[PDB]
Every structure is written in C-alpha cells, then in structure tokens.
Design a protein. Structure first.
Ligand SMILES: C[C@H]1c2cccc(O)c2C(=O)C2=C(O)[C@]3(O)C(=O)C(C(N)=O)=C(O)[C@@H](N(C)C)[C@@H]3[C@@H](O)[C@@H]21
Ligand SMILES: CCCCCCCCOCCOCCOCCOCCO
Ligand code: NA
Ligand code: NA
Ligand code: NA
Ligand code: NA
Ligand code: NA
Ligand code: NA
Ligand code: NA
Ligand code: NA
Ligand code: NA
Lengths: 331, 331, 331, 331, 331, 331
C-alpha cells in the first residue's frame, strides 16, 4: 500500500538578528512543503504467529530553507513484528519514546523551534529519529496503560565514527478523560566540544479532552548533561497548549519556553527562549485541514560551549516572527 | 495515482573543444535515462467547493553526464485548487509561465542547449521549475483565450541566503490552426558577479497545426538585464521548428539561436550561439514513441562577467554534435 | 508495478585494527537496512513485436555505515525489449555478466568483502552494477545453455571526465544437477595511480543443487591488469560454499580468498584475503527467510600503489568479525 | 511542649435552598473559630535508636454551626517512632495519605464543601482522620522523593459495630520547581444504604512555585465504588488553584467540581457540584495572616442511594454563597 | 500562657419542693469543682499596630449537679485586637455587656439563682456568655468613663437553626468611691413557646468602696418582652449587696429578688423570686481565698408559657437553702 | 505544672459469642490510646500551714471501642491540703480506697474485665472513680503503716436524681518484703432492678518484691449485697499475679476469677468468670516500657436480675481472647 501525507504551508518570517542583510536573507515568504510518500505493509509468515510488518516513509518533498527532492526511508523506516498479547517490536529508523511526546503534542502549533531542538545544553538532549534502533511498544494494558521503550545506536556510531548509544523509555496512563505522560532517555559516549558527554533527560506531561470542546496539554522537561572533564550542565523547559474546538473549528494557543542554563551550579545569563503562537484550524474534510498560524520567537543571546567556542542553538540564527497558512491531507 | 514517464536516449556526442583530452572526456556514447515516477491526485473537500489537487513527481533517474538516483518531488511538485470558473492555483514547485513556452515547443529537439539555459547574459534571465512559487492558470476563455501568471521566491531566497524573487506572465490566443504565444518574466535581487541584477525577458511566438500534416513553431526571445553598478546588457534569440506528419511518422527540423551580446551599447563580438537539428519519429504505439535524431551546436567563444572573471555559458564546454536514438513511454 | 525487497540485518562487528578508537568507532552493532522499492513494467507496443520492458529500482533505504535515504534508480534501472526468439536486450544500469556470478552464488554468506570488492589488483577488476550499458541476455537454448553479454561506459566516462569503458560475456551450461559457468570482463582506459590500465578478468565456477539437500558452489577468479608505464599485476581468487537443507532449514559454510598479488613477476608479501563463514537460514515463508551468520575476515598487511601512495582494499579498515541475524521479504 | 493554632474566620453565608425559612436558618453570619491547643514531645528511649514521639491535638474550640468546647485528641493525636534512615511510623489518629492531598492543597481557598466531602458516590470515598491507624512516612529520598502509606480500622469498626478497614498510599516527587502527587485509598466492608460497599479511589496532582510569584496546584480525583449487591458507581472531580504572591500579599483563585455520577453505566442527571472562590491574604507577621475570601457554591439536585432512600451529599443543604474575613496565628 | 482558676465549693442543699423524693434527690451534700484551665496570649503583628490578643478558657471540670470533664473554649474564648487609642475589640465567645453587671457584682454570693438566670419572663431576657459575638471595650476616657458595646448571633442561629441575634451596651462612670453602671440589651427573633419574641432589658446600678472598709452594690433590672401574637410581658428585679472588710476578712450580706410578672398589663400572682445570703470570707493568701456562706432561696409558684404548657424557671425545682464552704486560688 | 501519661496499646481481640456478626464487629484489631494529660500544683498559702494542692487530669484521648476526644477533669481531679503531721485530705473526684487495690496490683495484666468491673453481684459492688468525694490519705506511720479512708456521694446522687452514697477504708502494713493489704467499701441507697441495695465489699491481699527478681501479689475479694425486697446476693473473687524480672525485662503471668453467684443461699449455675494472662514487658527507659500480652476470658452464661430482665456483666459481650503490644510513657 502507498500512503501519503500532503502538507503545504505558506509562511512569511520576519527576522530580527541585528544584521539587516542577514535579516533579509533569512526572512521573507516561503513555501514549506512537508508532503511525503511512503510504503508500508504487513505479512503473515507461514511459520510465525507474530505478523511481519515493514514500512518505508520518504522525507519532506520540499521543506522550506531547503532544496527539492527526498529519498525513500528518510522518515520512519523499519521492519518488525506484532502480536496482540505483547505488542510490537520494530528495528530500523523510528521515533524514540521521548521524542514522540516532545513532538506531539508538545511542539504543535509551531513551538518546535524551542521545545523540539531549541536547546542551550551541551551533549545531546535526546534523539528524535535515529536509524539504528530497536523499539518495543506495549499494548494498551487494560485498554488504559501502555509502555514504549527503545535502545539504539548513536548518531556518529551509525557511520562507524564513534561509540555513542542511547536508550529511552516512556509510559502513558489514560485515566478517563485525561492522559498522563512520563518519559526518559539517556545518551552516552557523546563526543562534542572536545569532551565526551552523558545526557540524562526526563519529561512529565498531561493531556485532556473534554466535551465542552477544550483540550490541553502541558509538559515539564528536565535536561541534565555531564561532561568528561567533570563539568555539569542542567537546563529545563516547558510546553503547554490550550485549544477550544467548536463545530469545524479549532482555536489553539500554545506556549513553550526553555529556561536559563546552569553550568557547574552557576547560571548563564539570558540563555532562555520563549515562544507563543496562535492557530485557527478548519476541518475542511475528514481527511484534511486548513490552518493559519502566527508565532513570536524570543531566542537566547548565546552560550560558549565547553570548547572556548560558541555552541549552536535554534536561536543562533536570531529572533523572528512568523505568519503562515497551510494545508495537510492524509491518505 | 502513480504515473510514469519512461524515457531512454542513447546518444553519441562528438565534441570539438580545442583540447583533445577534453574532447575525449566530454564526448563518446552515453545512455540518458530521463524516466520518472510521479504521484498526483485530486480530492473534493467535503466543506469547500474547489477541488484539491496535488502532485509529487520524482527526478530523472540516471541522466547522461550524471550519477544515478533522484528523490521524489525533484520535478513538478505542488498542491493546489481548481474551480471551472477561475482556473487553477497551485503552490510549490511548478514551471514559470515563460519557461513553459521555452521548453515546449521552443527547445525540442535538442534546441535546449541553446534556447533553454544557453544564455550569454548576466544576472538570471528566467527560471526553470523553481520551488516557492504560486501559479494561476486561467480557463480557456471563450474556448479561445488563456492566461498564465505566477510569482515566486528566488534561488538563494529559497534557502534564506538572499532575497531573489520574480514574477512572470504568459498568454495564448487560438486563431483556428494558429496559436499566439506571449510571455514575460522579470527577476529581482539576483546576486551575481559581485553585483545585483534585474533581468527582464520578453517572448513572443506562434504555433500551427494543419490538416495536411504541416505544423510549425517560431519564437522571439528578448532578454534584458541591469546590474547594480549601472551596467546594462541586452541579448536576443529565436527558435523555430518545422515538422511534417504522415502516417505513423513525424519528421522535424529545428533551429534556435542566441545572438551577439551587447554590453553598455557596445556589441561583444562572437557571443552568439546557434543549433540546427533533425529528428525522425515513429509512433510505435499510442502510449509510446521511438525517435532518431541528430543535431549541431556551435557555441560562443566567451565573455568575462562583470567580475573580471569568465562567465559560464552552455558553450563553456565547447562546440559539439550529437546523434541519438531514444524511446519514450507514458503510463 | 511496485515490488520492494524488504531486508533488515542486525549485525555486530568486532574489529582488530591495531588502533582501539578505530575499533570502537568502526565496531559495535548497527542496523543494516537493505530494503529497497522498485517499479517495473511491460508494454506491447502496437507497432513493434518485441515486448517493451522497463524497471526502476531504488537504493538501500538505511544501510549500515551509512545515512538514511536513497533515491529511485540507484539499483537495476533500465529499458529494453524481449522476444522468445532472441532473448532480452536492456539499456541503462544493470549488472555486468561477471558481477552477477560474483554475487550469486559466490558471495552468498557474507563473503563479498573478500570476493566482491575485496580486491588488491590495480585499476578496475570488473564492474558492479554499471550505468550507461547495453546488455543482451540470451534465452535458455535447448533449456540447457544461455549467454550473457554486455558493454557499457566506464565509471569516469559517465560524467564526461574520461573514456574508460568495458565489455564482458559469460556463459552457463546446465549439465543435469550441475551448472557449469564461465565469465570474462575487460576494462579499458582506466585512469588510476597516475597511469592508465587495462584489466582483464576471467572466472570459472560450478554449482549444484541436489535432492539429498546437498547443494554446493565453487568458483575461481583470475584477474590480470597492466598499467600505462608497463607494469604488470596479477591476482587470483576463489570462493566456495557448502549447504545442506533439511525441511525448512538450510545450513551453510562459505570460504573465499584472494591470493597474494604478483607485480612485475615479483610477488608482494602478506597480501592475501580469506573469509570463513557459517549461517543458519530458516524459511519462515515462501517469500521470506530468517538467518543468523558469523564470519571472520583476515585482510592484507598493506600495498603501495604505483603512485607511491597506499591502495585502498577491503582491509584498509582492518581484520574484523561479525555476528548477525536478519530478515528478508520479497513482494 | 504546648503549641497552638489560633484561627478566627468571620463569615456571612447567603443560602438558596428553596425554603426561605430554612434559608434564614442556615444563612446569616457566624464566627468559625477553628483555634486549637495541642501537646507534643519526643523522648530518646535509653534502649532505642528510634526516637519516641507523641502528640495530642485538641479540636476546634468553637466551630461555626456547632457548639462550644472541644476535648483533647480530636485532631491528629498519636504515638510513634522515627529514625532518619527509614522515616517515621505513627499509631493513633492521623490523616490518611490521600486525605492530606485533598486538604492541602486541593481544598485551599475554601473549596472543601465540594472537593473534601462534596460527594455523590455511595459507600465511603476516603477517610478524613481515623483513630485506629498505622501510618508510615518515608524519608525524603535524595531529598526529592517521598512515600506515605497507611492502613487502619474503619469508622464503625472502631466502635465494635463493624469490620470496616482501609488502606492507602501516596507519593510525591519534587522535580525542581514542580511537585507531582499520586494517591490511592481503598475501603472495605462499608455498611451503608442497606448494602456492603468497597470503594477504590485514585488522585493525581501537581504543584509549582516560581520566582515570578505564581503558584499553582491541580488535581484529578477518580472515585469508584461497588456495592455487594452488584451495583457499580463511578464519579470523578477536579481541583485547581492559581495564585500570585507579591510582597506581603497573595491573590488566589480556586475552582473545584465533582462531575455527574455514573451508576451502573447510567449517568445521574444534574448531580455535579461546582465551586468558585477568590481570596486575598496579607502576611501581617511571619507567624500569622489576615485574609478575606468570597466563594460561590452550586450543588447537585439530588440522588437516591441504593436503599430506595435519599442519599446525603454535601449539597443536601442547598446552594449558598459566602464572604469572609479571618485570622490565623501559629505558635 | 497557661492560667487557671482552681475552684471548689462543698455545698449541702436542703430542698423543699412538696415531694420528699425530689427533696432527697435534689438535696444532700455535693462537691462543686468550678476549676478551669485556660490559654491566652497577645502578639504584636510585625505589620500591624494593634496588638493581637487571644484566649481559650476551658469549662468547669466537675460542676455540682453535673458530670465530669469540660472541653477547651467552653468559657471566654476569643481573638481580638487592642490599641490604646480606641480600646479593645474581641471576636468569638464572650460575655454580653449586661451579663457582666449581672454576674459581677450583682449575682454573688449565691444570688445567681435569682438574678442571673432566675427570670420568670418569656422570650429571652439576655445572654449568659454567647459565642458568635464581636465586642468592643473602650479605654477609661478621662480616667473616669468607660463604655462597653457588642452584638452577636443568637443561640439558635449559632447552629443554623434560626436567625436570633442581639445587641447590647453598657457604660461606667466613676464618681470618686462610686461607680455608676448602666446597660441595655435587646434580643430579636427568639423562637419560643410557639411564638417569636423581642426582649429588651435595661439595667441601672451603683457600687462603692470606702476607705473605712464599707462597700456595697445595688442594681435595678427592668425586663421587657413582646410576643409575635401581640402579647407583652414585663417583669423587674433588683439585687444589692453590703459588705464590711476588716483585716483579712470580708463579711457580706446579699439580697436579690425577681418581682411579680405582668402579662398584658395584668400581673400574675405569686411569680416573684427572692434570695437571702450571708458569706464570711478569709484571705488565706494573696492568691487564694477561703469562704463560708449560707443562702436561702424562695422561688415562684408557676406560670404557663403562651403554649398552654408550663414554663421553666429557676424555681421549677422548688425552694431550697444551701450552706457551703469553698476555696478559690488563681494562677 | 503539666504532666502527661502517653499510653498506646495495639490490641487484637477474637470474640466467641454464638453470633458471628457480633464476633466480627466486636472482634478485630483496634488502637486503644489511653494517653492522658493533666495539670497539678501546690501552693503555700501565706496565712495557712497546710500546703494547698490541686490537680486536673484529662481522660483517655482515644480509647478502644470509643470515639475521639476527652474533656478535662475526667480522671483524678481534686483540691486538698497536705501536712507532714496528718497526711493529705483531698476533695473532688478520686479513686475509692478499695478501687486502688483492685486496680493495683490486682487488675493488670488485663484482668480488669473480671476483677475490676467484672462482676455478677447486684446493686453496686464498689465505686471506681467517684466525684463528690472527700478522701483522707494517711501518712506512712512508722514508715510502715498507712490508712486510706473516704466518703462521697453516690453516682446517681451527683446529678440530683437520688441519694445513693458510700464510704470506705483500707490499710497497709509493710512487713519487710511483703506488704499486707486489707480493704472495705460500703454503698447505700443504690436504686437498681426496681429495688434499693446496700453493697458491702471486703478485700484482703498481699504483695511482695524480692532482690531475687521474684515479685508477686494475691488478693481475695468478698462482695455481699442486700436488696430492698429482702433478697440477698453474695459473690467472691480472687486475683493473683506472679512476675520474674531479669535485667530490663519482666515476665508476668496473671489469673483472676469471680466465683459463681449465690442468691438467697441458692447458687446460680455457671456464673463464674476467670481470666488468665501472660505478658512480657521491656523497660526501654526509666519513664517508659514496651509490652506484649495475651489473655483468655471465660465469662458467665447469664443472670436475670431481680426485675426478670437480664443483668449486664462483663460477659454480656461474650468470651474472647486478646493479643497486644503497647507503649507507656511518663510526664
Ligand atoms: C566497492 C564497494 C564498497 C567499497 C568500500 C566501502 C563500501 O562500503 C563498499 C560497499 O558497501 C559497496 C556496496 O555495498 C555496493 O552497493 C554493492 O555491494 C553492490 C551490490 N549490492 O551489488 C554494488 O553493485 C555497488 N554499487 C551499487 C554500484 C557497491 C560497491 O561498489 C561498494
Ligand atoms: C446604655 C443604657 O441605655 C441604652 C439605650 O438603648 C435603648 C435601646 O432602645 C430600644 C429600642 O427598641 C425598643 C422598642 O420598645
Ligand atoms: Na528570504
Ligand atoms: Na504506544
Ligand atoms: Na560503533
Ligand atoms: Na495554462
Ligand atoms: Na541470462
Ligand atoms: Na511525608
Ligand atoms: Na457533680
Ligand atoms: Na470594658
Ligand atoms: Na442564621
């Protein structure tokens, strides 16, 4: 079977970097095509109760700030097995258990720049989509409880350039109308800024959907990092979202912010990021939606990494605002 | 729907560059696979009358002179809407209205090296394809008249590396067997050769198809560009093609030429290009065609761009001829 | 038609190179996803008896030691014709007649590192999947005898940087349970190490498949090469594999070895390669297999090329072992 | 040692019950004196590392709606032992682990009538203070994690009229500025409405205090109850509070509501309760506070218990509003 | 601060009721422990000029004619504030301003049965120490004049069973050795005998203390009440006491009497009460006193309340005499 | 002065009555908190040689089988005088001379159910703690001999409902290691079962304490009773306890028994009670003890009193055993 997500977003960005040439370059209107086509299937092996599953999902066709064309298998690509008793194991390229909760619902509408990759910490906060990974998903135990857990190889280790590795786990309980989310993921042997890093990171969150039409999510993310020279770093963040849905409309209000980083007990001044964004969405068909979106990004003013040299953050390009309309179609 | 254009051309090229190694390198026989797979669809959104359309077309799988593999969305990739009253808006990656007429019919068979990207002018004449584009195609008004019109972001602006942008427009009138073709396209903030350019380019052309089997096309392309230091450049060109069609055959004769370039009123001698070409085509099936073809390109001898350094042209590799057969199948 | 081959292998590698960072980088476990998706079709052109065929094969989605994503047409991608009379001629990117026999059956249980690209000879032994190629496959005449024959452009020549080329032929006679097969491939105009080479390469082998469950194969590969300054180089190699099949199981043991290289009559010390391997394979479905395998590679101790610089060989990463399980599914 | 809590609250109540005679009775102004005197001590037993501890806390001296005078040991009155390693176990009359979190912070600006005893469920949701109880408090593991756990005798069983019993547990993790609260308490052998009941009940909650002066708490209470004649009942509720604290002032907003009760799958119409309340507090001394408070109570319209007879609820007296000033002194 | 009044009175009573069973029951010797323990304090709130005050005074531990045990806060229990400028306001449970003059000095020795609660009138004459009260005491203006004034809720309204309330005022002028005392108190919404009453009560009195050792007190009490059916009742009374004090001794003679009641102008015969009493007192310590006292009580002969049923008065137990010794120690 | 006795006993009871609901209610584990707080003091009156003493003792805070809270003055509460000459006279609520010897040492461990308030005799065997009482405690004459003597009003007489009363005396001579004890107490005007009774009760006992660690007590109780209609009743009883003391431990074994009741010379069948008990006690601090104890009660089978209605005994609840640990702490 072929399956696509058609995804077009027209988006004007107004950057304030302090350099007007850079501002005019980086800013302006663009088209962010995140449409993608993939293939997936299941197959009942003649000698195996677990059902064989496989999927190859290609990448974003023409993202903004980037060129055209995407190969196959740039997104979730894997083989695996599934039995209803014990769930589903996958091997390949997937979302770590924590990254799932960081993305949804914690990065939407457009908070990603700060809650997804918006970090000031060293090492490697967590991992989003990693290609050398085993991941088991538990069933909905009692139709209420589920565990997600995964181990995999590191970014550099997947190309034979290093020995980073990682594991992570998260669980979700759905108490009636609410849902509780907790998550952990640890990285080790992370080589960066001239030292070797160990990252531990924990996430707590909640989600609810009530008949009055209000829905919400809120999350606390605690990020630690310890360097090989004995340096310690700690930074934490939050994301939460308020939405009302009436008829074929959803209004949404989102806020996310990473807070100031502490290195070796001392705090690093003005190293936090904050994002507010508003979104209206129209349920134009059971299979697609239209949306308009505006956002305000206030980014950090800098952090030297442990190498006497700067460290890159989402705010390294500078503050900006963005108004956008888009479409997303599922098939 | 999945749709392909399967397209193979075996083509021997005999280069005369002035360097025998260079001739031996660039020349010889090659296979030009222009096959492509694409995906496109329409969807009637339940709460919106204009029908949604989308298409993701992959690139040339193994071009000649190139390596293998191309992603999806390397060719026409877009989403859009269409209503019978006001036409068709598509957003993403499409062909500018002028490039449409440059490719068809003005650049085939083998007139492309000269009419398509074969320029001697500075700045950026017009655009082939380009992402970050909105394009409106008008209906066939009165079953005689049609407008094509579009604006989009520039090459560097699409990576936040500049503020190039452009707009363009074209029209078509149908007098019986004739069709009149006019088109315009202007580019702004084109950063090149150390200056900033504004390229205006104007095109008029005609097309005919007669019951006896005679068909023809002819076009005038007028190209202007102004660099930020007050320099001006102007160059003009033409392409025309004659074909008679009998039975399961079309013989064709094509000629295109860029003329000498004028910079600041002075003509820069031997900056012109011209190609002659012949092609026999057999309609081997309703769904496919075979062709044999031969062409001769004589290219310019060079011109420094406004940076005291050379300027790249389609002729920078030197004059060459090419004999080729190919197949093309549509599915 | 869509036809993927889904293939995942989890494989631990323990290297002994003499540098432990190298061991730690290069070694460890990784996920080698060799899944690939393709498109193929046939079409009867109404005005041409030979049947039209075409195929577009995508690359490996996330191989080990490599990043994610592969375009379409990275593997066997071609157009061609087929008649019961004269067989099948194809144009595009295919496998040379010899590389087919080097892959099957001679690298079967992981022996490729030594028998496939495991080379020490200079220039270019042969070609693994080459673009710009015409290749004719003969029918199975008398249902016992078949010819494979092809020529194509060289690797450097396909980018207009040279005029290297190659041709090759192989034959297969099927003496009852055995199959006797021989093959040749010659490359010309190969630029390397500061000179130009002509590589001649001959391979003979046999394979059998028996009702007892015994099946076996053995091949000898003879590789000669001559450089532009008058140097001669020769290396030879062999591969064999034994397999017993009970029920839904296959046991396999494979061995392959390149022997020491002779340059200008003088043999060069400690230049052999040898790989030993065992694998258990389970036929979990007619369309899929499970397998576990472990192998031991002993590689060369080094070789200066004719440019006084080293030559890369499969052993430039060092001796290493690997234990692995995988899955493979065909649709 | 003697210790007191001095506590005076002047409070006018405006009742709407539908009977004005009853309205004038229950309504009007009163003084709710919750002052109390207690005694506690520790003593290091000559032969015992665990420190003997004991406390006798008398009751509210003159509550509103009640007579004067209170004995000793009407509030938390107990003996127990404490070691720093494993915490402190107490025996006597204490707060169940879940009830603590209902009193604080969940019933905080005057919501108790709704979240504390504001119930519609049958049986016995949880327990206030029970004077036949063993309760263990964990240390602050890592000065971050704490477990509280207890079992005890029931209300009727403490008088030799029954065999009620109960157990409960809760935990609290302090993630930097946050605190997460979870809690459970189950009662058994509850004789009521002519049947024997089993109540299971779970609580989720969160707490934060940030430099900007914001503080908050939010809680979900899930209450189930099963009668021995096979009836099932389910009800749930929530409490949350938002407060800003500037200088010597705290503004506070609290909202709590029980939702409609479900009995045997069927919902009981208009059986929910809702309370809104606002409070200003002045930190008149490190040891005491003055406060003003106003609140709005909307109660259920009734529920028959499983005995064909009415069931008493916190709302059985009817809706009312309340404005109040008070003082509370600690010594 | 802990403060007690230790108080024991051994008192034999000889009752004359007309029934020897009642006489033998009600009479005999008894121990009247009026000891009580209290807790009280003042505190200067750091952010408030008025000084905070509070007191919790327990009840009589074993009164005569009563069971053992008394809570805390059964007597004067309150919180309040004081500044030298405007006096002292207390909130909680206190003595009404008239009751103070009724108890001291008008009811001792043993005149309470007649002057304190001994009324014969319907409704509610006044209040003996009622909770739910605010009370303001003025400074000694000009070091001669003092006013006391307070309002609070009624008895039934203090339990939400009605809406009775009351107010009252008293003043004190000090003419040399004299003090003139006047006081008023009115009660409203008094539910009794099936009607609702409004009772107003006015009191005038004087006290003197002379250098030669003579002291005296005399008071007139005027008691009104109006029932809701239009009935009116009026009764009046007096109490006076003379005492001479020499050395460590005070001899005292007390007389008090309720007079005949008038209902609707018509006086009801034999409804008066009067008591005669003598007491010798020895000052055994600055902190304590011993006393012997004998008193003789003659009570009224009865009256139906407006409910056709008899009405309870201090005399419903019948006439009696009483001889007693006691001790009183203050700490 | 403040003084406390903190006393907690965890005690499981297993009842056997002949009805298992009663067994289930009454039985089970409970927390019996017998902690109590008191206040006492002495004062030398400046004009009086006898030293003034006073005490206010509160009741048990949460007994087993009973609710929370106890007032002040439920236990020994009195005023009195003390001189070295004549000892100590106290007035108020104290323990009668006989109840002391019945409580200590004859009732513990756990023998009270049978020896203290256990009983079958009519009227009122004796009085436990009585209010309205004067009791003279004699000095220890010759440092070996002492008298205790007291009279007070009866239980019903203390509320003016009767004229029951009582007096009593006991003496103790201390012959070396032994102490010989005799005691009497008589009650009069006891109304019960429709008759008036005079109860006579005599007790003799011994006590010993040796350096060997052996200590023991034995006591015989003789109870007679005569009713107003001329009936006679007689019951007698005995208690003894043997204890050995090693180090900080005390072993104790206790037995007590009421014998069958004799009414009017005829014995009433199966009316005896006997209880046996064992306890281990640990002297964990000079002011505190830990103890475990188990005991077995076999109670009488019933007795109609002189009203043809049943008579209540300690066995009206049925036979039972009890296992328990407790704590006891002083001041
Ligand atoms: C030379 C090989 C090599 C050298 C050094 C490091 C490597 O990792 C490799 C490979 O893994 C190769 C392959 O796997 C091939 O894809 C490979 O194994 C292969 C195949 N599966 O048939 C090919 O035909 C090759 N390709 C598709 C054109 C290619 C090899 O050329 C290389
Ligand atoms: C101080 C003493 O004087 C007090 C005066 O206040 C009297 C209150 O007036 C009563 C009003 O209602 C009376 C209706 O008969
Ligand atoms: Na831009
Ligand atoms: Na899951
Ligand atoms: Na590795
Ligand atoms: Na058009
Ligand atoms: Na073949
Ligand atoms: Na705790
Ligand atoms: Na009494
Ligand atoms: Na006063
Ligand atoms: Na009221």
């Amino acid at each position: 079977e072929v399956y696509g997500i058609i995804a077009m977003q027209a988006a004007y960005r107004d950057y304030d970097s302090g350099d007007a040439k850079q501002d005019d370059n980086l800013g302006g209107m663009q088209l962010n095509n995140e449409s993608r086509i993939g293939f997936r299937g299941k197959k009942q092996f003649a000698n195996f109760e677990p059902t064989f599953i496989w999927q190859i999902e290609g990448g974003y066709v023409d993202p903004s700030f980037g060129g055209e064309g995407a190969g196959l298998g740039e997104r979730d690509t894997f083989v695996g097995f599934e039995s209803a008793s014990w769930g589903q194991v996958r091997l390949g390229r997937v979302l770590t258990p924590m990254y799932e909760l960081v993305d949804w619902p914690a990065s939407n509408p457009g908070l990603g720049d700060v809650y997804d990759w918006g970090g000031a910490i060293g090492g490697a906060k967590y991992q989003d989509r990693q290609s050398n990974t085993i991941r088991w998903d538990s069933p909905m135990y009692a139709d209420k409880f589920s565990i997600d857990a995964a181990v995999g190889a590191g970014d550099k280790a997947g190309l034979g350039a290093g020995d980073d590795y990682w594991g992570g786990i998260a669980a979700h309980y759905k108490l009636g109308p609410l849902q509780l989310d907790a998550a952990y993921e640890g990285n080790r042997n992370i080589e960066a800024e001239g030292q070797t890093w160990e990252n531990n990171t924990y996430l707590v969150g909640v989600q609810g959907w009530f008949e009055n039409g209000i829905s919400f999510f809120a999350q606390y993310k605690y990020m630690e990092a310890d360097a090989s020279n004995g340096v310690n770093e700690k930074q934490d963040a939050m994301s939460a979202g308020l939405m009302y849905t009436t008829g074929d409309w959803q209004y949404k209000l989102g806020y996310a912010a990473n807070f100031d980083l502490e290195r070796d007990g001392k705090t690093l001044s003005n190293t936090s990021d904050d994002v507010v964004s508003a979104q209206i969405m129209y349920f134009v068909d059971p299979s697609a939606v239209l949306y308009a979106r505006a956002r305000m990004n206030d980014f950090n003013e800098g952090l030297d990494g442990l190498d006497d040299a700067a460290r890159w953050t989402s705010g390294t390009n500078g503050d900006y605002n963005e108004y956008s309309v888009g479409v997303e179609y599922y098939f």
